[PDB]
Design a protein around this ligand. Structure first.
Ligand SMILES: CC(C)CN(C[C@@H](O)[C@H](Cc1ccccc1)NC(=O)O[C@H]1CO[C@H]2OCC[C@H]21)S(=O)(=O)c1ccc2c(c1)CC[C@@H]2O
Lengths: 99, 99
């Protein structure tokens, strides 16, 4: 599809057997998801943006489906106000910017 | 152009007569630039990001050229970690997400 940017580019994703709404975010290197109790091992991490840093849990090789497009990669879980799909997964679904 | 996301979507912008590097950021509602001198009036504003809220100077109806495309709109200036081009200006240059 083609997504215009009049509104936030929110799409449904599927992760850990759950459906969620997430931002397609070209400004995020990595994917950051709202607090959820994923299984498996993880590593602590700190990520910074506007306002400072938040503490997140880094999970590797997590399967995510974005608009029926499957992807697998790193997912950061922490107290983010929004689910953020970053470039590490956007590349995998063939997402580009166009103007 | 068509911009892939294996790298950060950085582009050159012109604002206030000065060239700068900025990030095309579909996850940003607004355009937030690092501290700089801009001519004209401004008003204090607050914006929130992943780590909390910061105080910014809001400049309205500012000319800004992005990768050769002209836009005129709101620019927020403050202690952002990165110059970001948000949806308010991405729409003006005809930017969409495609996959
Ligand atoms: C600032 C960018 C360079 C990096 N961010 C990505 C931006 O797209 C954020 C996304 C967002 C949206 C809504 C709420 C919170 C965040 N938008 C943002 O702040 O927008 C401002 C201006 O407009 C307003 O509308 C939205 C909020 C205000 S991030 O979220 O800080 C981030 C993500 C991953 C990762 C990092 C950092 C570091 C490591 C990891 O890869």
């Amino acid at each position: 599809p083609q997504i215009t940017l009049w509104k936030r580019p929110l799409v449904t994703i599927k992760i850990g057997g759950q459906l969620k709404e997430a931002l397609l975010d070209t400004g995020a290197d990595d994917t950051v998801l709202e607090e959820m109790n994923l299984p498996g091992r993880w590593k602590p991490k700190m990520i910074g943006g506007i306002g400072g840093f938040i503490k997140v849990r880094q999970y590797d090789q997590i399967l995510i489906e974005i608009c029926g497009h499957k992807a697998i990669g790193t997912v950061l879980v922490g107290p983010t106000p929004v689910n953020i799909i970053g470039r590490n997964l956007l590349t995998q679904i063939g997402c580009t910017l166009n103007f």
